[PDB]
Amino acid sequence: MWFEILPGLAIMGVCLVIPGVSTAYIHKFTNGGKEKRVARVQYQWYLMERDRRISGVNRYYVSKGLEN
Amino acid sequence: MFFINILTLLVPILIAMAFLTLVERKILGYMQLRKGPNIVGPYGILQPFADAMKLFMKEPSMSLFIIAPTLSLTLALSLWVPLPMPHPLINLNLGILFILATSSLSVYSILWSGWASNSKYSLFGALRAVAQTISYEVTMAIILLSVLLMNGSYSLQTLITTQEHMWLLLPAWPMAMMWFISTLAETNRAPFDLTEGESEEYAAGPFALFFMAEYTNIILMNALTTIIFLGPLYYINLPELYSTNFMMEALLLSSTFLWIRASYPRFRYDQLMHLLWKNFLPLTLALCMWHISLPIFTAGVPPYM
Amino acid sequence: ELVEVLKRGVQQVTGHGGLRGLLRVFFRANDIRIGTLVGEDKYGNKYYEDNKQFFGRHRWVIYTTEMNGKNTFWDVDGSMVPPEWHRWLHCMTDDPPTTNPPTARKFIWTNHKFNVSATPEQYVPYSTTRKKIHEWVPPSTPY
Amino acid sequence: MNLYTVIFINILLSLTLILVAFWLPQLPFSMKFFLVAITFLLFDLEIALLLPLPWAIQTIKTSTMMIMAFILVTILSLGLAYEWTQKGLEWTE
Amino acid sequence: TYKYVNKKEQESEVDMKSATDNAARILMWTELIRGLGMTLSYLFREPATINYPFEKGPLSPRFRGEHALRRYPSGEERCIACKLCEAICPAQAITIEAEPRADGSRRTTRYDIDMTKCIYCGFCQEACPVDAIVEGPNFEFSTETHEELLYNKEKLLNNGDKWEAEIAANIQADYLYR
Amino acid sequence: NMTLNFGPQVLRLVLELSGEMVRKCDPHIGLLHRGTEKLIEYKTYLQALPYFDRLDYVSMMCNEQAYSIAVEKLLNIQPPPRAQWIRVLFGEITRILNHIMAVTTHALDIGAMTPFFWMFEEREKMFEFYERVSGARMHAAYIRPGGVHQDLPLGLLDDIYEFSKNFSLRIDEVEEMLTNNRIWRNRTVDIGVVTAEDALNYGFSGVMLRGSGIQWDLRKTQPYDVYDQVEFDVPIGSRGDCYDRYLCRVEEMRQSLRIIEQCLNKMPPGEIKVDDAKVSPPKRAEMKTSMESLIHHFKLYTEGYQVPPGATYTAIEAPKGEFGVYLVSDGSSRPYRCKIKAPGFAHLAGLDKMSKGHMLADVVAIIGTQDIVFGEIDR
Amino acid sequence: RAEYVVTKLDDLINWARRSSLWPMTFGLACCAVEMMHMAAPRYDMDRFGVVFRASPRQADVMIVAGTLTNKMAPALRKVYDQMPEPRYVVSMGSCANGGGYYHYSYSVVRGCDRIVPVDIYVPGCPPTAEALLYGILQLQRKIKREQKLKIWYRR
Ligand code: SF4
Ligand code: SF4
Numbered sequence A: 001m002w003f004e005i006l007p008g009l010a011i012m013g014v015c016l017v018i019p020g021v022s023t024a025y026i027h028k029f030t031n032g033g034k035e036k037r038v039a040r041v042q043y044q045w046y047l048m049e050r051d052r053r054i055s056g057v058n059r060y061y062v063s064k065g066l067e068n
Numbered sequence B: 001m002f003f004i005n006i007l008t009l010l011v012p013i014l015i016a017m018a019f020l021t022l023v024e025r026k027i028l029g030y031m032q033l034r035k036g037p038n039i040v041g042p043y044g045i046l047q048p049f050a051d052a053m054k055l056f057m058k059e060p061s062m063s064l065f066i067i068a069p070t071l072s073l074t075l076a077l078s079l080w081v082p083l084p085m086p087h088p089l090i091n092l093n094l095g096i097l098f099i100l101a102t103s104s105l106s107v108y109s110i111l112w113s114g115w116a117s118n119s120k121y122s123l124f125g126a127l128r129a130v131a132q133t134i135s136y137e138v139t140m141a142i143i144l145l146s147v148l149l150m151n152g153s154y155s156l157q158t159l160i161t162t163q164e165h166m167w168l169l170l171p172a173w174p175m176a177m178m179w180f181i182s183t184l185a186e187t188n189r190a191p192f193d194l195t196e197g198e199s200e201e202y203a204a205g206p207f208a209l210f211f212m213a214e215y216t217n218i219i220l221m222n223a224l225t226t227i228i229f230l231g232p233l234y235y236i237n238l239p240e241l242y243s244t245n246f247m248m249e250a251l252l253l254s255s256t257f258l259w260i261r262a263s264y265p266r267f268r269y270d271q272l273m274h275l276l277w278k279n280f281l282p283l284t285l286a287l288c289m290w291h292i293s294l295p296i297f298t299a300g301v302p303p304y305m
Numbered sequence C: 001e002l003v004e005v006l007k008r009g010v011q012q013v014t015g016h017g018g019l020r021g022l023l024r025v026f027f028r029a030n031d032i033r034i035g036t037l038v039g040e041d042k043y044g045n046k047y048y049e050d051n052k053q054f055f056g057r058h059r060w061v062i063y064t065t066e067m068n069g070k071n072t073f074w075d076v077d078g079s080m081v082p083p084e085w086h087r088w089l090h091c092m093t094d095d096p097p098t099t100n101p102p103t104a105r106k107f108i109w110t111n112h113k114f115n116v117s118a119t120p121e122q123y124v125p126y127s128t129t130r131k132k133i134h135e136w137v138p139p140s141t142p143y
Numbered sequence D: 001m002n003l004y005t006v007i008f009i010n011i012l013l014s015l016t017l018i019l020v021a022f023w024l025p026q027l028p029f030s031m032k033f034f035l036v037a038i039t040f041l042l043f044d045l046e047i048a049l050l051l052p053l054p055w056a057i058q059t060i061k062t063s064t065m066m067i068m069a070f071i072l073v074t075i076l077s078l079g080l081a082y083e084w085t086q087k088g089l090e091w092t093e
Numbered sequence E: 001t002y003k004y005v006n007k008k009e010q011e012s013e014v015d016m017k018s019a020t021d022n023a024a025r026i027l028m029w030t031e032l033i034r035g036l037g038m039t040l041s042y043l044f045r046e047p048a049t050i051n052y053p054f055e056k057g058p059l060s061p062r063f064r065g066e067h068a069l070r071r072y073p074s075g076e077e078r079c080i081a082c083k084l085c086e087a088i089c090p091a092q093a094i095t096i097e098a099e100p101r102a103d104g105s106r107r108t109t110r111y112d113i114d115m116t117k118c119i120y121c122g123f124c125q126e127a128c129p130v131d132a133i134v135e136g137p138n139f140e141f142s143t144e145t146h147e148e149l150l151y152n153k154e155k156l157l158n159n160g161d162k163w164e165a166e167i168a169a170n171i172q173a174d175y176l177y178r
Numbered sequence F: 001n002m003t004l005n006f007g008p009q010v011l012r013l014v015l016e017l018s019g020e021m022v023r024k025c026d027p028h029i030g031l032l033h034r035g036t037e038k039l040i041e042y043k044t045y046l047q048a049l050p051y052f053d054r055l056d057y058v059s060m061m062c063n064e065q066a067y068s069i070a071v072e073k074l075l076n077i078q079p080p081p082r083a084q085w086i087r088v089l090f091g092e093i094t095r096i097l098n099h100i101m102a103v104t105t106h107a108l109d110i111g112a113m114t115p116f117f118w119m120f121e122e123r124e125k126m127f128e129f130y131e132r133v134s135g136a137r138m139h140a141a142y143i144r145p146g147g148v149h150q151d152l153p154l155g156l157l158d159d160i161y162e163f164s165k166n167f168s169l170r171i172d173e174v175e176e177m178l179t180n181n182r183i184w185r186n187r188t189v190d191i192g193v194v195t196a197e198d199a200l201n202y203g204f205s206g207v208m209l210r211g212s213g214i215q216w217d218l219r220k221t222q223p224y225d226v227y228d229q230v231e232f233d234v235p236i237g238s239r240g241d242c243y244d245r246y247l248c249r250v251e252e253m254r255q256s257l258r259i260i261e262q263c264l265n266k267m268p269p270g271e272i273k274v275d276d277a278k279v280s281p282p283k284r285a286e287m288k289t290s291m292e293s294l295i296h297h298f299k300l301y302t303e304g305y306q307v308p309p310g311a312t313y314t315a316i317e318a319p320k321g322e323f324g325v326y327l328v329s330d331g332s333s334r335p336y337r338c339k340i341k342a343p344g345f346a347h348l349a350g351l352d353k354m355s356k357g358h359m360l361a362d363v364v365a366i367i368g369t370q371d372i373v374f375g376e377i378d379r
Numbered sequence G: 001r002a003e004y005v006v007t008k009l010d011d012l013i014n015w016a017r018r019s020s021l022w023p024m025t026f027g028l029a030c031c032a033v034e035m036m037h038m039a040a041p042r043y044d045m046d047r048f049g050v051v052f053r054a055s056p057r058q059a060d061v062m063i064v065a066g067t068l069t070n071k072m073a074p075a076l077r078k079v080y081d082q083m084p085e086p087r088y089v090v091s092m093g094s095c096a097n098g099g100g101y102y103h104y105s106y107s108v109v110r111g112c113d114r115i116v117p118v119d120i121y122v123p124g125c126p127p128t129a130e131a132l133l134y135g136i137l138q139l140q141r142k143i144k145r146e147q148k149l150k151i152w153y154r155r
């Protein structure tokens, strides 16, 4: 009966769920636990290039704090 | 990293398109009271690979012959790039306009196929389908131009933070009743699949490519609905939950398409263009004016970061 | 009222000869339904009945692996059904041989035969008659 | 670079598929159509004019944007209704 | 006693209520949704499908398929060359050539059929006064060549000596009706 | 003028087009002609029926019945009551079969393909009945001159009742999908609009008439069987469109059950084949014991039963219309001419007028209404 | 090895051309109601990965069903030439195997095996959809018993 379509429904479900979590976890692994910043404007890009310049490593996924 | 992500975005969607062909066959069979494929493998999870091997086994201007299907498929795959699930692969302001462009283009393939095939028979249907697709993409664009005024940005992330509290269907359903239909024309699905109903030149391989892109566009328009008019739950700690609810609603719409394909007859071309030009375009313009006034005789004028 | 269905499903699973038999069946004949066994031919063909299902599906059959020097685990026809059961299987009657055996007669084919399409023991046509017109058999001496 | 990568990848995948396909085995006019294409143009141009609302709305001259939008929409509808009444949407030859 | 379809019992009204219902059904698509509901209903039902090689459809003893000559319980044949099958076969399919038999009795030497012409009607088993030839139930004798279907006396005899364990019961049930 | 050909997707059409609308539609018949009326003359009156089953292949029994009735009008006899009733029964079952196939192929050629698969189960049930009675699925030799071949086994009536108990619900569940769907209403309405005078002239029959207001049914009039006994209300339409025709077909589907109910509840006992052994063969027990019955068996089955020189024109209300037979005969078993009259012929003669001014994808709906079958047409 | 895996590859590609079967249902006459009854629920052609209907240019098998006259022969040979290799054929009925009840007529092709080749035959007037399935399975086996790669690798 109608309980024979699940072996395709669940398949499509998992294979449409994989890309989202893939992207999220991958962005997070790269940028160190925090998501990938976005720049709809020049303001955020200025912030990002500033953090890049002061990272001491030339990468922006480093937030310093008050110990600088 | 990035190549890994593109693989995660391209391989699983092809897998899902295959198993979507399967699901179509099964649900149509169960609505016509029969089973559907249950033999090639357990409950029919190998028929798609069987079809692939068979097609690539079948024997048959090379320029058009190749560029048309390739173009269509590449567009259909690129359409996926800018989607949020929940954080996208490529955050693009104007993403939905990029979507509309790359969805409209395939008309070039449809048209080159005809202009190559000398068959007057072929140009007949080519012109007809091209015209219907064009005319429905018009409204497909105006609906967005009338809704997105709720979030003053053509982005696709802002949709989510917007729908945080409520959805986008309780309002704007005079549109969803359309955006859930034009999607049945650009895709040349039913009840507007006349382009495959009246037949009197696609070989095996290029046919496989055309069909791949067709069902990809199916999945993608359904995802666009699930994102726009059926806002999921964006609790930042649960991107998994977002993706999961998105999956659910996409499957629901993709089975609604099949309810339709099974139940209804097909539209006579003239009746169809009448439908559009004399029922949807006036309503569409008036509703766009309505949603233009709403943020003026109400404080609800949204921001632009 | 779903655990009844679930228990039905699990006893359906286990009814077969464990995982191995379940796999043999669920990969040869794509069914798992459990039902009574009433008869068993001499080749291995195991028949089954379940009179709570609808029509045409209340009887069924599990064929034999090897039949007359042949490997029929995958290869499976519908002509491998011997007649004295074929009749019932096709819904012509309601009493199997164990309670309605046939007439014990000779000159009947004991070892049934699967279909003979292109095998080297297939069928061909010919004439079953002698020569209508005889002829002259000349001598073997010169004059 | 990212979109370049993605697009090259998609194109190369499609071409691998088609190369597999190729290796593994071894008229009068209808004025109505032109009129419809023309309607499509004269609407896409309206679309180009009309898209910028999500940024024209956050300005201060609401009394101007509201008006100009209504104007465009209503005059376009007038042209549409005239085309209809003069039988550009009938298809019977 | 005629009738009238597609016609109202009288002229309709212009009630705002009737116009309202009309407008609703024209906008929100009530009837289309009802059709979708019906399809859902049939989706949630049992399918009439069956596995052919492991389940075979129903029939009745009166089937008409593969052919079969027959025998008495004493081994002897039943055909005596009465030729009714030849003179009644609508297709002229059958071909017979009879002769004596060294034991003095009467019998055949050629009883050939072309199952490409045989329309599977029943006239031969109706005419045969001795029930010799009986169009049988076997419908699985599809082949790969057009010469496994020009059956002859020996193939028919084999089919009889094979299926006689079923035709006996079939006829024992059916004959009274005829 | 873009004149083109059109085939399957037998139906070879040549469309003289103008843009998108039509100007002319010339069919090209003959793709299914064989030699029925050139073979019969070389045969008897009892190895001809198969031809009349193969003709209008859907029903087959409202055709065997026509042949039987012609032969009987020639032989100046009648069959018995049980035979007449059984024959009415199967006539109605065939009305149902043909209406189903017309409806569903209409909806299929349009694109709606679910009711096809739905009703084909019930069609399989009817075929189970044909099997229980005749022996084969479709092309049964059951109905024969001088009555019928065999009586009814002892497990049929109950099944027929149990099937009629549900066919109505299935019909309603298909109506729910179609008879109100605006899409079907727009595919069919104002199509194939016809006027009574031109229908009569062109020679239309049956539904193509009574969907245009006319009152003509060869069962109420020219009653060939017991149809004068039972009640069955005839449907008609006022407009004359494919919608009205569809609705006529469905209403006939229903009145056919209104008939079957009474056929069942009044079927009498008795015989099947008239006991005139010079015409219909006798039972086998007598064929074997007695002698004269054996002689008559022999003669019937080598030299068909002689027929006196006459000529007739019968008629039936087959699913479509005036299935007619002009059967000429010399004083011999081998007849001299058997002209069939199948309505598809005139339906095509009127297609070129029903398709003047309508678009390209309405020819299909026209043909669906006409229920075109080509076996009956080519002859 | 080489020959072993070559045989296995041929068996797999035969698996494909055996499951993904698409017919052109060239049904002229009353051997057609039975194709339709077969694609109907109770036997469900599709179950074996065999679609109800489909155009030639993408089809693999071709089911002839009905009298094959001298006006619809040309079209048939045209279709069988247009179709793409491989192209399997299935004759379904007396009329199309030996001209059936119309053998001795003047406007019949006394056998579709004259116009076109054949890989399977089926008797009937009509047949039974069950016998038709049996013919199609005989066809699946006539496929599974092919050794193209072996004959090439030993050409
Ligand atoms: S069944 Fe009919 S057609 Fe076939 S051999 Fe017998 S008499 Fe001839
Ligand atoms: S009717 Fe019977 S006995 Fe007479 S020739 Fe034919 S098979 Fe022989």
Ligand code: SF4
Pocket (backbone or CB within 6 Å): E119, F054, F139, G029, G030, G031, G032, G065, G066, G067, G092, G093, G094, G095, G096, G100, G124, G125, G126, G127
């Ligand atoms: S063999 Fe019989 S059923 Fe088949 S097409 Fe010919 S007449 Fe019709």
